Assembly symmetry: D2
Homo-oligomer: 114 residues x 4
């Protein structure tokens, strides 16, 4: 199944934050309407924040997260969860190796903001 | 129901990160085994990270998030989600006022790390 | 926070199914735009299906699950989860007493159908 | 990533229920101890319940859902959600064709019971 693709409400501000847990340097690309809107790159085995940014979902609402390590795409897992019919999380994990911890880059998208 | 209480695997490192979206100054207490382990505070209407830390869940695994603003406990919402039977998110939103956006302090707990 | 309220897409067929795990007889009311659209009643301590139905989310998309035992509202817990940006679950648990198992009536809403 | 595999608490009763939404007849296999513990079969495009059962999660607690249509494995998507730290849902969708609706068989596992 496709993973890391989410339809946000259109024209809505959202936060995106990435954490790293791997010996490999992680590159996280965030696309809005198929166009790169943010890129974070960092390395940590202690869950450091390698980037955080406020974006806007634009006219289409389409948001896609991609993760790669030294140019190789990581395998993604994702889901969206909504609490009290209001608070939204779009969640991504990724695996760059063999251990299937799926935390090598962890990406959290949250909305609404403000 | 009770919200913001999670049973993590015991003796396991986890990340905890808080974001703010409110005119009010948020005070976020993170309790492990019923004792305060971290306190994040700050103010933002733009989803700023007001704290991020690595903690150990200890012998009980019990982690609780509490949020105060204006000297009163915010109303909390929460859930835990597990992806590919490996990657865990414990999610918290909170409401300090009347608009029920539930984003005034947003807390993300993630594990495993490393 | 309000629980058991979900915004579905307008005019969309959805499934609703309820299970019982309590000595109390469970009554599950499903409202679509604030009007009762289905009602299930039954008693089981073994997860029996007390009702399943297909409904239409109608013009508003607003679907509300209420659970009561002989007219007394149970405490509710709920969330929505979306898998691969397409498959939606709206989940409800409920507690009619003191033990906090939250399974006394369990309600699953799923869409799309077909 | 692997989908449809969940760690339940060991030696614990759980409910498993499947719904069908496809022209193809769905075959849902539920494994405990890596061995088939239940199989549900049926055909519906209207979310019919094609099986519901109570099982014990066994020695390991590992429960796996597989779905096939005329013997061909469907692609699976899954996640687990925990509400109020008590009520657990393990959720599966499956895709037998080209439309990416992932509802062709929908499987819900819930625990605890009683
Ligand atoms: C090696 O590069 C694998 C890599 O880094 C490890 C430290 C660990 O985080 C592993 O999960 C990750 O795939
Ligand atoms: C007043 O302090 C209310 C408060 O701040 C607003 C800017 C908005 O974020 C609202 O959701 C929050 O409760
Ligand atoms: C009353 O007996 C309590 C009630 O029924 C029990 C059998 C058990 O399911 C409990 O969770 C429920 O609240
Ligand atoms: C075959 O026709 C495809 C199959 O059945 C359809 C009626 C629809 O449910 C589709 O999602 C499913 O894959
Ligand atoms: Ca890894
Ligand atoms: Ca890792
Ligand atoms: Ca608010
Ligand atoms: Ca706010
Ligand atoms: Ca109960
Ligand atoms: Ca019960
Ligand atoms: Ca399909
Ligand atoms: Ca289908």
């Amino acid at each position: 199944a496709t993973q890391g693709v989410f339809t946000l409400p259109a024209n809505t501000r959202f936060g995106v934050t990435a954490f790293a847990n791997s010996s490999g340097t992680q590159t996280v690309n965030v696309l809005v309407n198929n166009e790169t809107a943010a890129t974070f790159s960092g390395q940590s085995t202690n869950n450091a924040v390698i980037g955080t940014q406020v974006l806007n979902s634009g006219s289409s609402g389409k948001v896609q997260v991609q993760v790669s390590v030294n140019g190789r795409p990581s395998d993604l897992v994702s889901a969206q969860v909504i609490l009290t019919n209001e608070l939204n999380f779009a969640l991504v994990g990724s695996e760059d190796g063999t251990d299937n911890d799926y935390n090598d880059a962890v990406v959290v998208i949250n909305w609404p903001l403000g």
